[model samples]
Target chain A: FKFANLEASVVAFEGSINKRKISQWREWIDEKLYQPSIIIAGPQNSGKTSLLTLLTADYDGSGVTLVDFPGHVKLRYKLSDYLKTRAKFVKGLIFMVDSTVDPKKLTTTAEFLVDILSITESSCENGIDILIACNKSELFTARPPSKIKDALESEIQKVIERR
Target chain B: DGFKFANLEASVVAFEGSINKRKISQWREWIDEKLSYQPSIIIAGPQNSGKTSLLTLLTTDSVRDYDGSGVTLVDFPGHVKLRYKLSDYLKTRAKFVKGLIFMVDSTVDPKKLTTTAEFLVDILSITESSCENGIDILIACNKSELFTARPPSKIKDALESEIQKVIERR
Candidate 1:
């Protein structure tokens, strides 16, 4: 019967090198996904989800977990909650930011970073190894990471003082 | 026309003009004198909903989105010519267009309101992202100066109700 011939027929279909990797992918997804999960955080339209998918997909044949939070202003509070409760197994944070936006408009970005940094300060000093990942580096309007850090430093101070 | 009750951080005024012949001296004077805060605004509505009247009243307008922007007033044609008007602006000067003022004839028929609602929905879909408190909108309830004019509250219901019906059709 067609159903009973499963192994002979399907084995050839699975003969590709991807067969091994596919099951491994499934295995990684099903268990211990957070063993050393990396949390990616950013504001809306800042490429957080894009980076998360890219990093995981690039490392697919290898193994790692990339998680993202709701990054819109309305749902940003949820991020703090996630960091507070589900952060123990987390390895680090990769905070993504759009490189195109004007530096003057970065107060929102800085304030959101402040939110994550606030919690990270209180937790055990294993050092969450927070990394600011600026996407769209090749775009014409992109400011250098050095300039971005300087801009953030200024805005972050303003955000902290005003609050 | 006075903005009563709320403490307006900025102010509003009646800048009357007619068919390009009308004097916009008052309008020009106010804009020219105001602190160089040149933020832009878009005016959208369906045909005969006072869109032309508003546009003719000003004929005037930008070309810097971010001084981190402008006093540009982009007036989209009512209906027939407007399908691509709203979106084209978003794509080209997406970062620069700061505000929207959707006009609705308070005493108009439901068909116009349907048109108004659809365009309004297209406008709201992005603005309500609540991202930067971004893209503030002013639903300029027009024609209330006439008799049987619907108040803003009722007009809002008409718009919302029409929008719900319009969405269901799809």
Candidate 2:
């Protein structure tokens, strides 16, 4: 009976905290459970979904919740709100960017990064660790990670100045 | 191998690393011929700016048939990687472009006004230099359905003001 109530409470807690936030970190804290989480974010076709599929499929009942926000800007508003509220609890952020095309067109991508950084800058206690994953590295046309990093940094600086 | 177009000019010449005057003239003639046909218009803007929605509505009838005559709408996706390829491709086809439609989502934050203006300035400069005829730029303010959306006139003022700021900074 005790096990049944605990499981039911877990399910109820998960449902209640979800919509307004990304994960159940508060509920878990109340229930004396700890589960780490990672967020993967990028533009569409940048392979966030593909990475999620691979990770979830290969995981061996790990208590980590992997979250992927939609890459499309229209669909990202909700995710942005959720992130603003839940970023402090997130362990890390993986920002995936496609490297196959020229770097000049990354204005919007840089803008998104700027938005995320602004939201989490002061709220995260331990400082959010960010991984800028240069996706599609296998493609012959894909730029090296260093080149991609340089371009993104330059573009992000432009975004900051413009804003 | 040289560029090829079906049902138009006919010539196949292969030269390594150098083009003679005759080949250059032939190339110009081919491009001229292509331009004489349907005019190409590019739909461009920042991501989530309703570029695709505007493209679909303008290009096709409600029944999915093309509604325009002698006009081709080239939809350039706002995705960062695709935008790069499209920007490069636009340079090659610049002379043939008759118009450039830049879409803007008015529901966006005020902080984005400058970035949007920067993109517009880049496109305008590139297209202006490329097209022999003056490029027709249409700034379409979209997403007026949302109550938070700024009016078109306001958006125009903001963009114009921001463009001036960008120039001053430069």
Candidate 3:
């Protein structure tokens, strides 16, 4: 069967349970897992964890491990350590934000994104691709994804000036 | 080996064939012992279906606190070696199970549908024949963080039809 063109490399285990799929899975884990694993990093309650739950509802086979980086400001140092440790293997990064967040906190969010992007750029062979998921768009206070992007970029540019 | 049925919305279901006939009586006695409280929920799925991540989210207050009180969650490893034990558990003790939360990755290929269906069939058949009130089965389609995730409705349709084929073969 033709698999849907997926950015994440999917390895499906077919037929009755046996040693073969297990062996193949083991082989892949030992050999090929260095290939890009996706990381979902975002602010708390930004729907990062919920997105993972939504995806796993129909998952019947083995695949990549998701590393959910906490988005709390106090946890910023720890998140940096996490990114430093795993940045080499990360192919893509999803920087999620709740659309209803207070406007004042956008600067902090932008700064956090800058830190993560710097780490990935230094570590990954080909710089990591970032997807800013402006979650909770259904909420009346939510801004468009493009606006969110522009705001973060503007905030990031301010950081560059301070530096 | 004892099974639990409690008042929680308990959308997930699981069956274990782990105990023997003698153990069945012991489980019944144990079930009676827990009559005052709700039984724990077991997180079951194939390997790499984000069981550990799911458990963390449910258990941790910092991440996403489970709103209601009195939730007991048991984490079972989804390794292949452990699968034999799960199969054994399903064959014997499935009837007493109240809910089955079967998790699947949304990105799973169509090729593995039959294999997925077979496992679902096994769990359903064992639980359906033994219990008068059907078990609550919640299929979680995980890994939506990825862009390629298949829609939940599509996955549901595929599994339903595949399950039908499985039933026809029986």
Candidate 4:
């Protein structure tokens, strides 16, 4: 029961931070985090490139470590490598998703994010923060922050409440 | 490649660039000779979001009469390398730019919306608010002809609201 509550705390805190703020660590307390390892994940053609640009350019003092993964396999490997090397000390990952596409994709995307978060949450004692960017809200049907927040909350329970 | 678009009657071949430095130089001079006005405007947006079409129209004076200045328009890539490439350029050119036109495709997925909103906020905060003699940033929601499917004003309002939200979070 103690373990479960501890897991829940990690999951809940990690799940709520916004991806944009998390991606670039201007405000991320690096001293408090591990190494500030952030992963920008999303389905292909979902405007990840554009978001990265905005983050890097927007903040005058932001020194964001953007891992520009070429494809999915590479992305997973990159995260794993970072996890093995620095997960103990690194901050959480900033996941990106294209919310303009199908709702089914969002579910799948959520699952993938949860899987990643579970790994990070379990590995790190500091409890890495999971920042999610539900992108393309410019679209008329773009999921609200509340909806994206729900997705993160749902994924966290799968990690925290279950194991 | 053809020096000019064949259909247009006006002499616009002056902007053409060739492998030969002399020919390119001549083209540059020729273009400078023809322009009646010059304005620096930065056009940006997501890929397949009509940025190209809008840029083409604006550059060619189809949308309005732009006197193809020596540096009339600059286009950054819209694909996956958008932030790395465009942000670098914007940062490098922050001092000299006149204005910025932020275009958005209202039909993109919801997940991407937050990313897009954050990106825009960062841009506005960096270029307009942070820098000295900052450029004007305007939000243009393109592909409005799809209003039967999506409205432009709402998208604009939503985007503006997103920027506000980012501010609040900060």
Candidate 5:
């Protein structure tokens, strides 16, 4: 959980969801979330919004809220603000990425993730399950799922270290 | 008396919890209505790591699934209160969660091993507060293509060593 650029802080992380293990994430979320909501994220055009739609298809009513943050990166700043007020109500987070971006871009992407993790360290708990969706791994010379997983873990560590 | 929302400083609604089953059902319906398309994630990482990138990627992907009309990823800067968005959400219902994945960049210089270890400890401590088993630490070493002849094992081992360092400090 250490990093090269950012200083590390030792703050407590609470689990985003305190539900039972081995259960359907959605069901678990509903049972435990006072305000349950699944969040979808990833690189641009990597299917973040698409995933959000599919996830909410099973629910009843207008199941989505779209907040626009013009001054910041796409949906990041707004989402953070929402979580601040309703973190108690959030359900889970889905991080989607394009497997085909350049290695430098990927590294830069990882670096951005590191920052989010550092900031979220104090904002979120340790129990939140991080689901990563890699779109078009074939683009990255068919990067194995194993490798992708490894990269994600490493990136997360960098974020933790920054904290 | 009616379905009215309140903010932190907003007026409280005095409801008859035990006296209104029909109203409770209506409120539940309303709650479900609001939650139809939202998925929450606790995005974490250092200042420069791809935390934002990952969030951006996922936000884009979420659209494919109709997860939400829009994906909002927040950047928290030294504001721990913002995290309540995730933890308070869990506490609101009084349940427990298992663990979350930690994203890492393997290409990170080995010299930063000590700092990395401290980050792991920080992650574990964060999860330990509300979870019984604590958070499961997962790592992702990005940009393998750039590593050239480097082996994945080497990267993982380097991180493991940093983890040990962090733990030793505690």
Candidate 6:
């Protein structure tokens, strides 16, 4: 697909997108994800380490590996690496967001969502499905997954159209 | 208080479906009889929000429902698929709409809230209706027979906070 940013080229996006570091995701499947693959993303670091740690044990005996990049707002460019190097092996995405009442997390989540939404759109699609996982539902400030989903949807659309 | 739906200058009322006959005296008195115009209301909601069940559940011929301009209920399916249906409906028949009934399940759940609000956002976006107070929408809620269920206004309140968060970010 073309540069997800639309006005630019993939080569241009690729050239600039790799200038930073920090943050990450992973999975297993086939000869370069010959299907049966899943990648998890949680920028909050420890927010989703358990799943990554559990799955990273390589117990399933598959050469197909899940690639994770350092995940941070500034480090977002690493996604370019995933797109350039890993998109062919991809099948789906699991985007995790902190559901607690930290307040600002929603916007951060929305930004990430917009990027990934755009990323998925440009990463080329046979229509890969995305599952938004809401962690820490026990917190009083944590909203229902439904609420979180809608919030991101509208917020994403607003920015999409505002430009 | 203009934001208070109860106080909005335009009249609005919530609907509950009843399979058993009896209580709709005014529904028949107004809706069943002929009138000067074919006024209609749009019923919108997310999947499983019961849009069709609601319209069909009522005994249509005579319930004495309203002081009719002959109210016709247009059902918008709660299916969350590409909304070409509603888009086509609005393209051709939007002007005929006199009001809207944004329905939702009364039992609290995340699906209910997201599906309801997202669809509700689209409905509310379809026209500049609310901004100018041109249309009044009923937050049609039902099926709260659950002993653990919260109040019907919970849907409204949930939408209030839910939608506000969305708009605030925008």
TM-score of each: 0.32, 0.34, 0.33, 0.32, 0.33, 0.36
Estimate, for each residue in A129-163, the C-alpha lDDT of model 2 and write its tens digit.
55565555556776776667667667877776764
Model 1: residues with Cα > 4 Å off, grouped in runs: A1-34, A57-81, A84-88, B1-170
**Each model's number of backbone clashes?**
2, 0, 31, 24, 140, 21
Single out the weakest 10-residue window by summed lDDT for candidate 5 chain B: B12-21
**Residue pairs whose backbone atoms clash in candidate 2:** none
DockQ of candidate 3 (2 decimals)? 0.01
Q: Give per-residue CA lDDT, model 1, range B58-151, as digits (tens).
A: 4433120111011111111100110123333344444554555565666758677777777766656655442344455555666555666777
Instruction: Compute the lDDT of residue A58 as modeled in candidate 3.
Output: 27
**Residues B7-123 of candidate 3: C-alpha lDDT, one tens digit per residue:** 223333222211111112222232233222233333445555555555444335232221111111110111111112333333333443334456676677877788877777666
Please give the lDDT score at residue B57 for candidate 5. Answer: 38
- Give the docking tier of candidate 6: incorrect
Model 2 global lDDT (CA atoms, 0 to 1): 0.45
**Residue A80, model 4, lDDT:** 41
How far does residue A74 in candidate 4 sit from its true spot (Å)?
9.3
Q: Which lDDT value does model 5 have at A48?
A: 41
List fnat per candidate, in order.
0.00, 0.00, 0.01, 0.00, 0.06, 0.00
What's the chain B TM-score of candidate 5? 0.52
Per-residue C-alpha lDDT of model 5 across residues A37-108, encoded as one tens digit per residue: 545444445554443333331111111121111111111234445556556555455455554445556665
Off by over 4 Å in 3: A1-36, A57-89, B1-170
Model 1, A68-140: lDDT tens per residue?
1110001112333444444566545545665566755698888776776666555555435454555565667
Model 2: docking quality category: incorrect
